A paper describes a structure:
The ferrous iron transport (Feo) system is the primary prokaryotic Fe2+ import machinery, and two constituent proteins (FeoA and FeoB) are conserved across most bacterial species. The function of FeoA is unknown, but we do know that FeoA is an ≈8-kDa, cytoplasmic β-barrel protein comprising an Src homology 3 (SH3)–like fold, which is commonly involved in protein–protein interactions. Interestingly, in some pathogens such as Porphyromonas gingivalis (the causative agent of gingivitis) and Bacteroides fragilis (a commensal organism implicated in drug-resistant peritoneal infections), the feo operon is predicted to encode a single FeoAB fusion protein in which FeoA is naturally tethered to the soluble G-protein domain of FeoB. Herein, we provide the first biochemical and biophysical characterization of the soluble domain of the B. fragilis FeoAB fusion protein (BfNFeoAB).
However, after ≈11 months of equilibration, crystals were obtained in ammonium sulfate and dipotassium phosphate that were further optimized by grid screening. Despite the age of the crystals, diffraction was routinely observed to <2 Å resolution, with our best datasets extending to 1.50 Å. Initial refinement revealed the presence of two molecules of only the FeoA domain (BfFeoA) in the asymmetric unit (ASU). After iterative rounds of rebuilding and refinement, our BfFeoA model converged with Rw = 0.192 and Rf = 0.236. The β-barrel is composed of five β-strands, while two α-helices make up the clamp region of BfFeoA, which comprises a series of hydrophobic residues (Phe23, Ile27, Met30, Ile59, and Leu61) that we have hypothesized to be important for mediating FeoA–NFeoB interactions. An additional 310-helix at the beginning of the N-terminus contacts both the final α-helix and β-strand that feed out of and into the hydrophobic clamp, respectively. Residues comprising both the linker region between FeoA and NFeoB are completely absent from the structure, likely a result of proteolytic degradation in the crystallization drop over time. While sequence analysis of the FeoA polypeptide does not suggest this is a common proteolytic site, the new C-terminus created after proteolysis is unambiguously present in the electron density. The overall structure of BfFeoA is similar to other FeoA proteins that have been determined by NMR or X-ray crystallography, including the hydrophobic cleft putatively involved in protein–protein interactions, suggesting that the FeoA domain in an FeoAB fusion may function similarly to stand-alone FeoA proteins.
Author numbering: 1 to 74
Write the structure that this text describes.
């Protein structure tokens, strides 16, 4: 499933960052690396961005960016 599908309080593990080269390197550089848990701190309906936590850091992504990250839910 895509990361944007997780609701507030849910967790998953990154399996793949999709998109083109520039987008991928941008997202991976924020800390979205394979095999680490991502926790949803706030996915508020219709509001942008979504607030995540991974590698111990708070990171916000636009919903359309989180649409492009494949995860497996915990």
């Amino acid at each position: 499933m895509r990361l944007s599908e997780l609701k507030t309080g849910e967790k998953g593990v990154i399996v793949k960052v999709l998109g083109h080269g520039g987008f991928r390197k941008r997202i991976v550089e924020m800390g979205f690396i394979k095999g680490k848990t991502v926790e949803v701190l706030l996915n508020a309906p219709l509001k942008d961005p979504i607030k995540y936590k991974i590698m111990g850091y708070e990171i916000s992504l636009r919903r359309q960016e989180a649409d492009m990250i494949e995860i497996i839910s915990e």
